[PDB]
Write a protein that binds this ligand. Structure first.
Ligand SMILES: Cc1cn([C@H]2C[C@H](OP(=O)(O)O)[C@@H](COP(=O)(O)O)O2)c(=O)[nH]c1=O
Ligand SMILES: [Ca+2]
Length: 129
């Protein structure tokens, strides 16, 4: 897998961000994770976490997996990095997302995220509290 440059246009919620990628705007949906919706418990905290992570970053990168790069709603599917730190993994490690939507062929970072979920759960963090 390879990291590609992109720039934040706007944070949207816990697991979706609008980025400029190859000079076109697109909504990216974070691979392998599921945050609460804004109206649900921890929804606002997941949104605020992803917003601060993305907005604070000097450099945002997108990393596609081996499989489909857009979903059925035309959203990009990627691992997103903020100054080298994976947002997907970070949300999970904080108990602000569950591992979810694991489809064959786009699952390269599954065990890494599962490892992070295990530790958030062990710590009784947020969603796991
Ligand atoms: C994360 C991800 C979501 N999706 C689709 C599955 C779900 O379809 P359905 O909308 O029919 O339930 C939806 C969940 O996205 P959200 O969690 O953003 O709502 O997005 C993919 O198809 N591939 C993916 O990798
Ligand atoms: Ca969601």
């Amino acid at each position: 897998l390879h990291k590609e440059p992109a720039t934040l246009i706007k944070a949207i919620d816990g697991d979706t961000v609008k980025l400029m990628y190859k000079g076109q705007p697109m909504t990216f949906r974070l691979l392998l994770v599921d945050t609460p919706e804004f109206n649900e418990k921890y929804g606002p905290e997941a949104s605020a976490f992803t917003k601060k992570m993305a907005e604070n970053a000097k450099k945002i990168e997108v990393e596609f997996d081996k499989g489909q790069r857009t979903d059925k709603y035309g959203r990009g599917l990627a691992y997103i990095y903020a100054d080298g730190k994976m947002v997907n993994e970070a949300l999970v490690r904080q108990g602000l997302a569950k591992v979810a939507y694991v489809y064959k062929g786009n699952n390269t970072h599954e065990q890494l995220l599962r490892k992070a979920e295990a530790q958030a759960k062990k710590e009784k963090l947020n969603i796991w509290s």
